[PDB]
């Protein structure tokens, strides 16, 4: 039977940084403000008043 002094140190993997992978964006999630209305009105406003 043995007894310990120093708590284990978690080894850190090295290499390229792991990119973001999830269903959505997270903190980088913002929204566009649209005039009051239904979903269709907002979608129409966004599509008709924007260029990509």
């Amino acid at each position: 039977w043995t007894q310990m002094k120093k708590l284990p140190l978690l080894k850190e993997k090295e290499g390229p940084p792991s990119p973001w992978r999830a269903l959505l964006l997270g903190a980088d999630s913002e929204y566009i403000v649209c005039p009051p209305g239904t979903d269709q009105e907002a979608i129409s406003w966004i599509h008709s008043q924007s260029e990509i």
Partner: protein, 138 residues
């Protein structure tokens, strides 16, 4: 949206629409007007409003804001009038059939928004005041 684009962008079309929609004439878009407005009792009130706004300003069919107000009143006027309930005053804004889309008289919110800089119908800027006139080029 198509009906409002037709009425706003063309003064002659707006005049024809108002004339056919006020005196119960044959309008090529009667079914559209009937299907857009639910059963109500605002017909005669809207027709009367049309009367005051045609008598006071016979030159109305050049300001797009006036065209929008006249088209709104005309669309309400020829709706499916309820047989039983008595006629009431026309509401400032109403609701389209089978949808949560609000149509407004002053066009401050909903399907038509007319700011001093521009008029937007259905989320698309139909009129941009100052640049890009409604009519094309030759």
């Amino acid at each position: 949206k198509s009906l409002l684009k037709s009425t706003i962008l063309h003064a002659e079309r707006c005049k024809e629409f108002v004339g056919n929609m006020l005196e119960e004439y044959q309008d090529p878009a009667e079914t559209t007007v009937q299907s857009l407005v639910p059963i109500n009792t605002w017909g005669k009130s809207a027709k009367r409003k049309l009367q005051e706004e045609i008598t006071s300003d016979p030159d109305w069919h050049q300001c797009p804001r006036k065209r929008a107000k006249m088209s709104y009143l005309a669309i309400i006027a020829g709706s499916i009038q309820d047989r039983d309930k008595k006629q009431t005053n026309v509401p400032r804004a109403f609701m389209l059939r089978g949808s949560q889309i609000e149509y407004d008289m002053k066009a401050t919110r909903g399907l038509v928004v007319d700011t001093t800089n521009r008029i937007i119908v259905g989320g698309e800027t139909v009129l941009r005041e100052g640049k890009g006139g409604p009519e094309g080029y030759v």
